[PDB]
Amino acid sequence: TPVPLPNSEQFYLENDRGEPYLIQVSWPLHWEDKQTGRGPLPIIYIVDGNALFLTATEAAWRRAAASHFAGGGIIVAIGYPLKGKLYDARRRSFDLTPPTACAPVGYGGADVFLDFIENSVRPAVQARFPQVSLAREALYGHSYGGLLALHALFTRPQSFDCYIASSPSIWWNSLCILHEAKAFVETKQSPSLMVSWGSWEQHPPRWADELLDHYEARKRTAAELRMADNALDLCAMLHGCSRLHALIKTEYEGEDHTSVMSCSVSRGLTMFFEDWPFHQS
Amino acid sequence: PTPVPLPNSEQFYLENDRGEPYLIQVSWPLHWEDKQTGRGPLPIIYIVDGNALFLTATEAAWRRAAASHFAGGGIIVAIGYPLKGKLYDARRRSFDLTPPTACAPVGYGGADVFLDFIENSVRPAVQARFPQVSLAREALYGHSYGGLLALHALFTRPQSFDCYIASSPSIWWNSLCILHEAKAFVETKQSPSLMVSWGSWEQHPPRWADELLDHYEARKRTAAELRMADNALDLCAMLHGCSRLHALIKTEYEGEDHTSVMSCSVSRGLTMFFEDWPFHQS
After folding, report:
1. Which chain B residues are closer than 8 Å to A57 by Cβ?
2. What is the β-pairing status of strands A20-26 and A8-14?
3. Does B251 touch chain A (CB under 8 A)?
4. Which of A131, A178, B204, B265 has the highest CB neighbour number within 10 Å of its CB?
């Protein structure tokens, strides 16, 4: 017998270009149905939805037993029609990267995707919960998704209340995203930003029985991606900025680029659902 | 809109030697066409309070497919209860996860019944669903009372599993009665491994925004009584250097509370068991 998923649903939406998206939604587990939810609730939108929906859903459900639980929120995972894999490399390359003059073909569709989230996904989800009003909205993404979250903050800060950038791919075009950050701070209720990374991303330890050639290759890749220091450079630029209410930065000790996803999505939704508004930075 | 399916997974029901029902949820690597793709040795992790952790363990295992240290993954087995609208069965787990003692209240002390169920019913049942798969090694994961179960299994039946993963173990329970078993374990004469973890906010919780001082002091008092970090550190100290334990990995997760640490500990537990085995001698 297959495993049923309670208090959740999925449906397909097409963007204005006719490209399909899998929208997966879940809500607090104790609810008899969607209509039992009344009043203001927070909502989190998670890009690369197929990779993270289940963990976000279940982590949110685990909060019901926690002392600091406030009522929870709605999880929305924005993904792709997939079988046997968690990512759509072609689709996400366009959807999650900002437009640049030097970007290769199939990149630079972040604003098209952000428009799709605001104009199609958000109303579609709102229509599933007519009694519920949206108290606040968070955008979560990891890697290229984290780059998207930062791009959204710097170019359309009013779009979401909270931006959660897990291990953001600042390396993809550091000149681009850091120029956008510089333009953001130098320009005249502010949103909040959570930035995180794993401590093994830039400084990976050697595995047991790992050959030296293989390890030096991993170390060189890690140095080029520069995950921790690019994130710290960005957070330094944003320090003392009036256009940001709070900036929370977190290095997860002992986590790599993949493993940190469990930590960051769980803490991201938990803090957004239970610790809002954040303390002023 | 439709219900959300879970691919490369299944569930079935088994009952213990007392006729009590259990929900067994199983998942396998996402790229597999189905269960028959797997051949040769695979690691397997058994997760108690299965309803609360199956999806996170499943998806975290699937996320490893993109990681550099991926080595084919393994099988996730969540051992839970027939439940609707909640993740825990407080009454059932109170019996199943606590060890027998003379002064334990009614409804506690059924850990050995449950461990027998896992070894004699769950393990063969899972082995039957993957006939071509050899079980290379087996881990037992549990959180809170589940962590107490994992420690009890190590101390009284160390041969049962290769790895024991005790997430925020309730060592405090019944006047620290697990410490008698730990003492008996070290003093008597391939050794298994132990992973112990806890969140840094468990014993030392920070104050919430808009929380009254009286409410916060009550939380600090409860935290001081449970003594999560120091009881775990006290236990690890007596176990370190023991000949009957191959490795002892201890982890304090900074900024995690008793609930939030579950995401971290289950994810790291399965990942290390699947990818970093054998552990270094500790």
Report:
1. 55
2. antiparallel
3. yes
4. B265
